[PDB]
């Protein structure tokens, strides 16, 4: 496989390598707070883990959309790749099992810590898009 793609690519013809669970995502584990205060008791934003070939994103809202318009809070998470993939087979499941238990998380600059005690609803109105 590798000596055939060595020769096709040396003449400028189209090549291709077939992978099983390719390491396309660099390791990243962080968060984003769209609403915060120094008490850290009314928050909103997303958390994610990108590692290997797996994305687990989870959005939270402490008020549970009590003052949102039509009681709906919108979330979004955009992951750019490094190389263009072709003909992928992707499994999508409606729960982030890693962001489901109570934990304490440091602040953005490492100053203080804040507490996150989740209960989990189902995701409403899911849309996954594949851009080029």
């Amino acid at each position: 496989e590798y000596i055939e793609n060595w020769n096709l690519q040396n003449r400028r013809q189209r090549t291709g390598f077939t992978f099983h669970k390719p390491n396309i995502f660099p390791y990243s584990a962080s968060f984003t707070l769209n609403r915060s205060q120094p008490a850290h008791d009314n928050l909103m934003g997303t958390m994610w883990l990108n590692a290997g070939s797996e994305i687990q994103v989870a959005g939270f809202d402490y008020s549970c959309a009590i003052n949102a318009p039509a009681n709906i809070q919108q979330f979004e998470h955009i992951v750019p790749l490094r190389r263009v993939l072709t003909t992928a087979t992707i499994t999508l499941l409606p729960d982030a099992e890693r962001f489901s238990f109570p934990r304490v998380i440091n602040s953005a600059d490492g100053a203080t810590t804040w507490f996150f005690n989740p209960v989990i609803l189902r995701p409403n109105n899911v849309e996954v898009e594949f851009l080029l």
Binding site: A29, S30, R35, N42, A108, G110, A111
Partner: protein
């Protein structure tokens, strides 16, 4: 540095913690202890403020950093409570008679109220949602509420006769009035000694705690019947001597300061979010 705008904050979940910084808070900030005026009567001293301030030096606070004030009772403290310094904690006795009035003071100082003036003579009044209350304080408040209809006629009241009005308060130093939300009302505040004020609550206050000295532990800080939470900064301790009450506060400064925080309004970053 971009005072008005809201901007999101990102940050990694793998970052080393900072130092302890509980010490440096004691070097800079202030502290106010409040007590009823009969506490100093049992103490029988004119140097016990000097005596306590020697004991706060052990826990890191400097000499001129801790301030002491007085009040007579919670009925006369509540005609004008204003909290000045950075951190403070108030001390109140338990009265079985003053059930609601302990809950009024713990409503007024533990939350944060955005307030607009009112004019009883000129307009007709209503409450918009669940966060709208009518806070009224003064020497002697007496409030009578005449609800109107969609044609501005009285419901149970005559809009000319003030006797057919409907009373919610009698000669109180402070009132927080909850009426039904969405109905125009007609009002009878005795404005010579009282001052009604259209208020609206934001998020609560972070720098004051309340120590309920003695009794049971009941305080309805909220407005509904269906819940009544007991937050972090309201607490209770038993008593026989007011010396032992004061020794417990001086010993456990580091826990009481930990339960409260700095007032988020007081910072620079709230410059157009209502407090520079």
């Amino acid at each position: 540095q971009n005072y008005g705008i809201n901007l999101p904050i990102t940050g990694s979940m793998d970052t080393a913690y900072a130092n302890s910084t509980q010490e440096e808070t004691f070097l800079t900030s202030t502290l106010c202890l409040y007590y009823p005026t009969e506490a100093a009567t049992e103490i029988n001293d004119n140097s016990w403020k000097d005596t306590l301030s020697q004991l706060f030096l052990t826990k890191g606070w400097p000499t001129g950093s801790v301030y002491f004030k007085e009040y007579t009772n919670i009925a006369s403290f509540s005609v004008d409570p204003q909290l000045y310094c950075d951190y403070n904690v108030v001390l109140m006795k338990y009265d079985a008679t003053l059930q609601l009035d302990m809950s009024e003071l713990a409503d007024l100082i533990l939350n944060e109220w955005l307030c607009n003036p009112m004019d009883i003579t000129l307009y007709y009044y209503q409450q918009t949602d669940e966060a709208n209350k009518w806070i009224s304080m003064g020497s002697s408040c007496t409030i009578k509420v005449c609800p109107l209809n969609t044609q501005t006629l009285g419901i149970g009241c005559l809009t000319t006769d003030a006797t057919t009005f409907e009373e919610v308060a009698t000669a109180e130093k402070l009132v927080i009035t909850d009426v039904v939300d969405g109905v125009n009302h007609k009002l009878d505040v005795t404005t010579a000694t009282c001052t009604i004020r259209n208020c609206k609550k934001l998020g609560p206050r972070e720098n004051v705690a309340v120590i309920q000295v003695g009794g049971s532990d009941i305080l309805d800080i909220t407005a509904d019947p269906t819940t009544a939470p007991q937050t972090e900064r309201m607490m209770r301790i038993n008593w026989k001597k007011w010396w032992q009450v004061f020794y417990t506060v001086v010993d456990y400064v580091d826990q009481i300061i930990q339960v409260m925080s700095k007032r988020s309004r007081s910072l620079n970053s709230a410059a157009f979010y209502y407090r520079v």
